[PDB]
């Protein structure tokens, strides 16, 4: 006797709302999409000092969830014939031809297996010239293709090459090509002056208001800002790729194709992928220190999971994000906060909600 919208709101109140007080989080947006119906739940303030409530217009930083858009851009360029994932970066960034990094192929860059790229660029690598010099001075460590080490410079370089192959800056790849193709009208690499009123403050661990600062190859690694409606639309596209023209449909499918495994995690393009149903521990393991911060041997896919799910966490200094979707259940969920909370809490709360919603 309780309508489905209320049942979903109750589950979000039970599992996500307590996080606001536990982690002193000013604002949160949680969305669920099920069977093409969208449910949006907003809590708290996008700006504490302005007493401005979080709402459907609130723009949040996606952090590493941005890599999903970079992966989609790569799938689009590949399916248009602009790149092959077997190409090396010097084919497009000519200044890298005949350098050691030109031995790594695009898929290895997108999926973090160059064997010598860390989580972040060095602090002093700032300018375009400094980024190029960094890649020219790169030298292999581990055998190329054997070890996964999660890396912003790695997928950032992939993104730059994708942009080169499409003859536009990366920001314009997303804002002029990818976002319009996915029907996202409130998603940005650079938030225009006319929308800054909707851009939430992030909040640091001292609850002080902040927003992301510029950095090297920031756009492809962690550069996107979006709203909850737009992120529900992005989940919708991933749930229904057959609803887009062939090139974008194939681009989306490319991001869903698992490439190798590390234990129970399948590395797709941008997305992490898992057999469904996935135990909670499987999902937590994907965000463990061992997987996120250390190098790990990759193995070929053995079980190609027929029934599967995908997720991705992301953070910036002042924001947290989690997105997850389950194709055969026709369901997905997005969480956006303007303060980081532990990845494990995001995964746990989403797991409880998604498993309890009636089919």
Author numbering: 1 to 359
Paper text:
Class C Acinetobacter-derived cephalosporinases (ADCs) represent an important target for inhibition in the multidrug-resistant pathogen Acinetobacter baumannii. The class C Acinetobacter-derived cephalosporinases (ADCs) play a significant role in antibiotic resistance in A. baumannii. β-Lactamase-mediated resistance to β-lactams can be overcome using combination therapy involving a β-lactamase inhibitor coupled with a partner β-lactam antibiotic. Many ADC variants have emerged, and characterization of their structural and functional differences is essential. X-ray crystal structures of ADC variants in this study provide a structural context for substrate profile differences and show that the inhibitor adopts a similar conformation in all ADC variants, despite small changes near their active sites.
For example, ADC-30 and ADC-162 differ only at position 220 (Ala220 in ADC-30; Glu220 in ADC-162), and ADC-33 and -219 differ only at position 222 (Gly222 in ADC-33; Asp222 in ADC-219). In the apo X-ray crystal structures of the variants (resolutions ranging from 1.24–1.89 Å), the Ω-loop conformations show more variation than in the complexes. The two variants lacking an Ala duplication in this region (ADC-30 and ADC-162) have Ω-loops with nearly identical conformations. In contrast, ADC-30 and -162 form a tight turn that restricts the active site with the Leu216 side chain oriented toward the interior of the enzyme, and the side chain of Asp217 forming hydrogen bonds with the main chain amide nitrogen of Gly214, both presumably stabilizing this turn. Overall, the B-factors of atoms in the Ω-loops are elevated more in the Adup variants, suggesting that the Ω-loop is more flexible in this region of the Adup variants: ADC-30 (loop 20.4 Å2; B monomer 21.0 Å2) and ADC-162 (loop 23.0 Å2; B monomer 22.3 Å2) vs ADC-33 (loop 20.8 Å2; B monomer 18.8 Å2) ADC-212 (loop 21.8 Å2, B monomer 19.7 Å2) ADC-219 (loop 41.4 Å2, B monomer 35.7 Å2). Overall, the variants that do not contain an Ala insertion showed little to no change in their Ω-loop conformations upon binding of the inhibitor MB076.
